Amino acid sequence: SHMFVNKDQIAKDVKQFYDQALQQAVVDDDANNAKAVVKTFHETVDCCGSSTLAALTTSVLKNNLCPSGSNIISNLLKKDCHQKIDDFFSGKL
Amino acid sequence: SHMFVNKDQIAKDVKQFYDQALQQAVVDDDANNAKAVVKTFHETVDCCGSSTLAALTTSVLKNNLCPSGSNIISNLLKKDCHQKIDDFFSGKL
Numbered sequence A, B: 001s002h003m004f005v006n007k008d009q010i011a012k013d014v015k016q017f018y019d020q021a022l023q024q025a026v027v028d029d030d031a032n033n034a035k036a037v038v039k040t041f042h043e044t045v046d047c048c049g050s051s052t053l054a055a056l057t058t059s060v061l062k063n064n065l066c067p068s069g070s071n072i073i074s075n076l077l078k079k080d081c082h083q084k085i086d087d088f089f090s091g092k093l
Helices: A007-027 A032-045 A054-062 A081-090 B007-027 B032-045 B054-062 B081-090
Strands: A002-006 B002-006
Touching: A002 A007, A007 A032, A007 A054, A007 A081, A032 A081, A032 B032, B002 B007, B007 B032, B007 B054, B007 B081, B032 B081
Parallel strands: none
Antiparallel strands: A002 B002
């Protein structure tokens, strides 16, 4: 039950999973569960794309895998998916 | 970074979130992100339905929100979504 954890490592592991999903979504039109996973995560947490993978975020945005009304300009003022994950494990609230 | 956590409570919170999504998916054909969230979680972790909400698991199964080939009979021998969440925070491996 009660246990010692490193939240920074957990944030890293989550971002790594996200990034794996993201790179499968952008590239493979056969990988529709990867696209599904990414689009529903994006929609649900309201984020679009990555820090580690910023140049690839352009693709998901064009394949309509980010939230509706999500565009290059509106995104400028929004936290990306890595920022949101980090802030959640930070508990920055 | 390093911090004391109750993993049983985290498992509870995750199952509660799942259950909220599940009850929105079964009922509301207007709630397509809830259906999306449930179907992609199911597909990704390979589980179908709940412990707390067993009588409602029948609905998602018929609306095709569980993995392909997932049926009432095959499901008998598979962990449901609550069991899988619990076992993951247990680290039962």
